[PDB]
């Protein structure tokens, strides 16, 4: 879904932009690892496992 912006009055004069952030997007090791690297942002591992 390339965030293209055609600006130039001439053809192909486009800008390519990237969106990738969200709540589940935290430590992008490569993708979401699992309980770590993304789901601490989502699930918040500090419950009692921390204690």
């Amino acid at each position: 879904k390339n965030l293209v912006f055609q600006i130039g009055a001439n053809a192909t004069q486009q800008i390519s932009v990237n969106i990738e952030d969200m709540g589940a997007d935290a430590l992008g090791i490569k993708e979401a690892d699992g309980s770590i690297a993304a789901l601490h942002s989502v699930n918040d591992l500090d419950v009692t496992k921390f204690a």
Partner: protein, 51 residues
């Protein structure tokens, strides 16, 4: 002479008629062109403003 004179009178007539045809098509193509300007406006907008 008179044969040619009269033929030149009808020649002027025919040429003026030529002009009438010309300017008819001319003004029509001018309007066509103006549309095409609007079209290209809509092409640049139909860059989707990108996405």
């Amino acid at each position: 002479m008179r044969g040619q004179i009269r033929g030149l009178e009808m020649a002027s007539k025919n040429s003026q008629d030529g002009i009438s045809l010309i300017q008819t098509a001319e003004g029509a193509l001018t309007e066509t062109h103006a549309i095409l300007q609007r079209v290209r406006e809509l092409v640049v907008q139909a860059g989707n403003t990108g996405t």
